[PDB]
Design a binder for this molecule. Structure first.
Ligand SMILES: CC(=O)N[C@@H]1[C@@H](O)[C@H](O[C@@H]2O[C@H](CO)[C@@H](O)[C@H](O)[C@H]2NC(C)=O)[C@@H](CO)O[C@@H]1O
Ligand SMILES: CC(=O)N[C@@H]1[C@@H](O)[C@H](O)[C@@H](CO)O[C@H]1O
Ligand SMILES: CC(=O)N[C@@H]1[C@@H](O)[C@H](O)[C@@H](CO)O[C@H]1O
Ligand SMILES: *[C@@H]1O[C@H](CO)[C@@H](O)[C@H](O)[C@H]1NC(C)=O
Length: 540
């Protein structure tokens, strides 16, 4: 007679191709990429003959076979593809095979193949749009936004984006390499701990707790291998397979290492570490380079060289070559993008007409044109055009676009930036003709989280009532609010100025719109980005 029916032993059923060490702070130890997950199953036979061969089946296909030598057994084998499998133990003899009932096993991998889709309702004022314009609709999400801001990946209105950028991936390095981080309490030390035993100029993760270990919706079970932002982003990819999720390397305080990459030894090490990062974290779709900025004038006053423009072009070409190779190895398309200064002087330090051939999208940082760092020269921080009271204003969106086009950049490469926050001043005084910008300030406006910066959610929620004036400057295409009793003046984007940018993008055949930072919107800004680019209302 055929063997008795085996009973699968109670035991762990959750396995991982990329293993996470739960007691490690160094990135080198935190993540272990394997070629396959090590899976184990045991069984007992309570009734009948134990057979002569035991097999482990996954969805009916043998993953392991061995002699059946007694009433209990154990099998260890490898599984090289993530997902969920119906696992059975079968006992066989010459008279037949008898299979256990199925037990589901989970084999995790960093594409999120083991995760249920993270498909969350739109929150606040966000309304559904279809991504059918063919234009970029992008936004950055910041790693540390999950703390005080409480803005997690399940709050991203992901169906309303084509591109979600993750800020920010650091480049390893201590003294002289990441000195800009020392201005943020604890942050330089946090990077040194993440990078312990890891070569300078390789990428890492700045905050492994936020990125991988903090419990979040959909990744709360203790043995879920990937939690935090990365686990949720994997689940988000399962819900939105066409969303491009890009890691952004750099930003204001993590850009110092780029200034050393004129040394090809370092640049090669960096590019290779980016490839390894994308092979490790399969849910990412390419790389965004947020080097602030070639030539200097970013966070570090001691960095910047006339060589930086050449280094930037070489870096883009080598990144593209690495991504093209990764693409044909995987069958996937990978994107290379960069966030760049929108000032003409800064733009002209780089030959973007050359670099554009390596890049899918240029994220033009057409914001922060004015702010509390200068209390004497006030202006619109993210306007399309110059205002009527100063038509020679240098820092406008159009002037940045025009600087790129004049180099020879194709317009379809250029993604115009919108702000989901305001910048502002206090004590504005001595202005003429009811235009507060013609005055001078005494300090920064009180911020939501940081001095001189106010989330758009708070502008709409608190500063559009009471004593606050509201004015839309139709020449500049820029709104502003002003409280005369205290001289508080805030410059920001609203639905109308975003609409003007979207129409400008369509008219000039630009690439689309993007914002920083997604957590600060109440929905008004992203809704307008979508509508103004011609995306249809509804769900896809
Ligand atoms: C588009 C651009 O280059 N904007 C600059 C701002 O980024 C600078 O403010 C800095 O912003 C970063 C985040 O991007 C903060 O981490 C940093 O603390 C902040 N620094 C200061 C001094 O506010 C700004 C500084 O003058 O310069 C541009 O606006
Ligand atoms: C007000 C604010 O956003 N502060 C954050 C801080 O929480 C975080 O530790 C740091 C990371 O370097 O970036 C900054
Ligand atoms: C890289 C870094 O230092 N990140 C810190 C994080 O550790 C801290 O929990 C958070 C609190 O706001 O601020 C940020
Ligand atoms: C900007 O400064 C804030 C305040 O210290 C910090 O939280 C954040 O990491 C900085 N942003 C970037 C992109 O460096």
């Amino acid at each position: 007679a055929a063997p008795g029916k085996p009973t699968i032993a109670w035991g762990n059923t959750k396995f991982a191709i990329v293993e996470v060490d739960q007691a490690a702070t160094a990135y080198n130890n935190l993540v272990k990429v394997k070629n396959a997950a090590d899976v184990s199953v045991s069984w007992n036979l309570w009734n009948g003959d134990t057979g002569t061969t035991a097999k482990v089946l996954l969805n009916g296909k043998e993953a392991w076979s061995g002699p059946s030598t007694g009433s209990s057994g154990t099998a260890n084998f490898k599984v090289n593809k993530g997902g969920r499998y119906q696992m059975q133990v079968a006992l066989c003899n010459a008279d037949g095979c008898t299979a256990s009932d199925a037990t589901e096993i989970v084999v995790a991998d960093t594409d999120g193949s083991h995760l249920a889709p993270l498909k969350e309702p739109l929150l606040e004022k966000n309304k559904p749009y279809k991504q059918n314009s063919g234009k970029v609709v992008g936004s950055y999400f910041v790693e540390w936004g999950v703390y005080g801001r409480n803005f997690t990946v399940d709050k991203i209105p992901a169906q309303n984006l084509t591109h979600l950028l993750y800020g920010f991936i650091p480049i390893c390095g201590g003294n002289g390499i990441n000195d800009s981080l020392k201005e943020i309490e604890g942050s330089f030390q946090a990077l040194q701990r993440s990078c312990q035993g890891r070569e300078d100029f390789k990428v890492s993760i700045h905050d492994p707790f936020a990125a991988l270990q903090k419990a979040q919706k959909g990744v709360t079970a203790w043995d879920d291998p990937y939690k935090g932002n990365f686990g949720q982003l994997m689940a988000l990819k399962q819900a939105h397979p066409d969303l491009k999720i890009l890691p952004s390397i750099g930003g204001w305080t993590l850009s110092d290492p780029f200034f050393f990459m004129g040394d090809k030894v370092k640049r090669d090490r960096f590019v290779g570490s980016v490839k390894e990062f994308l092979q490790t974290w399969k849910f990412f779709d390419g790389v965004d380079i947020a080097w602030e900025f070639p030539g200097g004038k970013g966070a570090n006053p001691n960095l910047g060289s006339p060589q930086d423009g050449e280094t930037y072009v070489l870096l883009m070409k080598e990144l593209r070559a690495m991504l093209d190779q990764l693409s044909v190895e995987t069958g996937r398309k990978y994107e290379l993008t960069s966030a760049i200064s929108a000032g003409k002087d800064m733009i002209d330090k780089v030959a973007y007409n050359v670099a554009q051939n390596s890049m899918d999208h240029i994220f033009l940082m057409s914001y922060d044109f004015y702010g509390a760092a200068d209390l004497k020269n006030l202006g619109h921080q993210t306007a399309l055009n110059a205002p009527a009271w100063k038509p020679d204003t240098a820092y406008t969106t159009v002037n940045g676009v025009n600087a790129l086009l004049a180099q020879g950049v194709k317009p379809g490469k250029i993604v115009v930036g919108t702000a989901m926050y305001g910048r502002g001043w206090t004590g504005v005084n001595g202005y003429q003709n009811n235009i507060p910008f013609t005055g001078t300030a005494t300090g920064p406006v009180k911020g939501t989280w940081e001095n001189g910066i106010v989330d758009y959610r708070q502008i709409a929620g608190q500063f559009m009532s009471g004593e606050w004036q509201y004015t839309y400057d139709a020449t500049a295409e820029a709104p502003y609010v002003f409280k005369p009793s205290t001289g508080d003046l805030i410059t920001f984007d609203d639905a109308r100025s975003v609409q003007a940018k979207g129409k400008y993008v369509l008219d000039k055949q630009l690439g689309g719109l993007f914002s920083a930072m997604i957590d600060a919107d109440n929905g008004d800004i992203l809704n307008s980005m979508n509508a103004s680019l011609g995306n249809s209302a509804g769900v896809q």
